[PDB]
Every structure is written in structure tokens, then in C-alpha cells.
Design a protein around this nucleic acid. Structure first.
Length: 337
RNA sequence: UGUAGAUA
């Protein structure tokens, strides 16, 4: 390194200033303590002081966008720099988007830059992803970037991402990074576009609720979706209430079904299991005794009306001195009051 | 008694 920096790593300069590290901006930024020294002084800095530094981040900007320390520095400028340094940084970035989006460091920046630019540059920076949509949605770095777009970017500039997901919904609603994206779209995108998705979604409601993350997506719509889409799902559940509340994943979804259904639907779903006797005993006998099902049951009571709840507990008197036996049942006896 | 994304 240089002594200047060596002296900084040894604490030999207590009131070190920006001007005093001219010619060494870069080096500093690829060094943890110096990157950190700059990140701080940039916030409390004169316009002359920032530009000084800027001058030296520009010609090796890409290098610092990928450095493990150099990347917070570029990001500071997006936060606290001038409009012109922000567009200038954009410049730097044009036609480098895809690569930085997939890089461990570059995409943090990209993620920040996407947050601090007018729609014009925002709109521009995104189309560079066109035709590598699915490649980014399934990347470990790329995926927060796409998510970052769906959030920051005006929705009408992202039809290419709705298209890209066509007939792809299940593979992604059943993917690790794939399903967070699908949530964003349903949180941000226009009716025009959340229609094909919600459509494929319903195509595999039964399967998705059994997926590791697939359910998180059905779970999303139940909570946040339009009441027309809820009812369709709850309907997928109606009947299957027994076979799914014993599922490790599917239980979590019936849960939110009983929570987010119509008043009516809700009182029908609940009742379904208070009178669809299964085997030796009745329906909710198993649900009580089951490692996952009991939460579904405890939820039954939660959302219930005083009328239909009374009836539930009346069906749960015949086994009071029966649940003490099974421990998962034990968490139920502490409610019949 | 029960489930999910990347930096010093």
C-alpha cells in the first residue's frame, strides 16, 4: 500500500480530512477502514470536497462497483451526491447492468442507484435486463435487483417481465428466489399484468400449497389479494381441509384461509370439519392430535363467531380428558375457556 | 408444539 494509508491503518492521523487523501481516493476505497473513512466524511462534506473525491471514483468507477469495500462509496454518491454526479455514474453504468446485477457487489450499487434516479434513468437501466429476465430472477444477486425494479420502477416499463414469466409461474412460485419476485409483482404491478400470473397461479393452487415456498405465494394472495382470488383458493381448500392441515406447508395456508375468507366461506370452512366425521371418531379428532393440524384448529376458534364458536367447543367437550394424553392436543385444552 | 432471498 502507500504510507498515507499505512499511517491511517495505524491511527497516525486523528483529524485526517478528505483533501489530505487526494490521489489516494481509490486505494482507500478498496481498503475497509478507508472506504469507511470516506463513506462518513462524504455525508458531512462541502460540495468542493465531494467533487474532489468524485473526480477519482469516475475513471475506475466500475472497478469500485465490484470491489468488496469500494461499493459502499459509489452508493454514497447515489445517496448524498449531486444530481449530475448521479447521472454521470449512470452513464458509467450503461451497458454494464446485467453483469453488475449478477455480481456480489455490483448489484448492491445497482440496487441503490435504482433508488436514487429519476424514472428516465430508472427506465433506461432496466431494459438492459430484457431477455435475461429469468436469468436474474433465479440469481442470488440478480434477484433482489429484479425485486428492486418491480418496486422502484414505474410499473408500465415492466411488461417484459410479465411476458417473461408467462407459462413460467409454477417453476418460479416453486423456486427459492423465484417466489419472492412473484410476490413483488403482485404487490406492485398493474391489473393488466397480475392477471396472467394470478391465472397460472390458480392452475396449481393444490400443488403450490404443498411446496416449500409455493405456499408462501398462495399465502400472499390470501392475505393481500383481491377478494375474487381469495374465494377461488379457499374453494381449493374446501373439502381438502383435513388432508392439508396435516401438511407441514399446507397447514400454514389453511390457517390464512380461515383468516381471510368471506364471513360466510369462513363459517362454512370451519363447519366443514365439525361435521365430516372421518373414521373411528369424528373429523377434528385427528386435527387435534396432529403435529401441524392443531394450529389450524386453534385458528378455527380464533376467527369464529360467538354462535358457531360455542358449537365448536361443544364438540370439544367429549375429549377433554382425551387431549391430556397427546401433547399436541395439550395446546388445545388451554382454550376451552 | 410448525415453514423462505445477497456484502465489511
Amino acid at each position: 500500500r502507500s504510507r498515507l494509508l499505512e499511517d491511517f491503518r495505524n491511527n497516525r492521523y486523528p483529524n485526517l480530512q478528505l483533501r489530505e487523501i487526494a490521489g489516494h481516493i481509490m486505494e482507500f476505497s478498496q481498503d475497509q477502514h478507508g472506504s469507511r473513512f470516506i463513506q462518513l466524511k462524504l455525508e458531512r462534506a462541502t460540495p468542493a470536497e465531494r467533487q474532489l473525491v468524485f473526480n477519482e471514483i469516475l475513471q475506475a468507477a466500475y472497478q469500485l462497483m465490484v470491489d468488496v469495500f469500494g461499493n459502499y462509496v459509489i452508493q454514497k454518491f447515489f445517496e448524498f451526491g449531486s444530481l449530475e454526479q448521479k447521472l454521470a455514474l449512470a452513464e458509467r453504468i450503461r451497458g454494464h447492468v446485467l453483469s453488475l446485477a449478477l455480481q456480489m457487489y455490483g448489484c448492491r450499487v445497482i440496487q441503490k442507484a435504482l433508488e436514487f434516479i429519476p424514472s428516465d434513468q430508472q427506465n433506461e437501466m432496466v431494459r438492459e435486463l430484457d431477455g435475461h429476465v429469468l436469468k436474474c430472477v433465479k440469481d442470488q444477486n440478480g434477484n433482489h435487483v429484479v425485486q428492486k425494479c418491480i418496486e422502484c420502477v414505474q410499473p408500465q416499463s415492466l411488461q417484459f417481465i410479465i411476458d417473461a414469466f408467462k407459462g413460467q409461474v409454477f417453476a418460479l412460485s416453486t423456486h427459492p428466489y423465484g417466489c419472492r419476485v412473484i410476490q413483488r409483482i403482485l404487490e406492485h404491478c398493474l391489473p393488466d399484468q397480475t392477471l396472467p400470473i394470478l391465472e397460472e397461479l390458480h392452475q396449481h393452487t393444490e400443488q403450490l400449497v404443498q411446496d416449500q415456498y409455493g405456499n408462501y405465494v398462495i399465502q400472499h394472495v390470501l392475505e393481500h389479494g383481491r377478494p375474487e382470488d381469495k374465494s377461488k383458493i379457499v374453494a381449493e381448500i374446501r373439502g381438502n381441509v383435513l388432508v392439508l392441515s396435516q401438511h407441514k406447508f399446507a397447514s400454514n395456508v389453511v390457517e390464512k384461509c380461515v383468516t381471510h375468507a368471506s364471513r360466510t366461506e369462513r363459517a362454512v370452512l370451519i363447519d366443514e370439519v365439525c361435521t365430516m366425521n372421518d373414521g373411528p371418531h369424528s373429523a377434528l379428532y385427528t386435527m387435534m392430535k396432529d403435529q401441524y393440524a392443531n394450529y389450524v384448529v386453534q385458528k378455527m376458534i380464533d376467527v369464529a363467531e360467538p354462535g358457531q364458536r360455542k358449537i365448536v367447543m361443544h364438540k370439544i367437550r367429549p375429549h377433554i380428558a382425551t387431549l391430556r394424553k397427546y401433547t399436541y392436543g395439550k395446546h388445545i385444552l388451554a382454550k376451552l375457556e
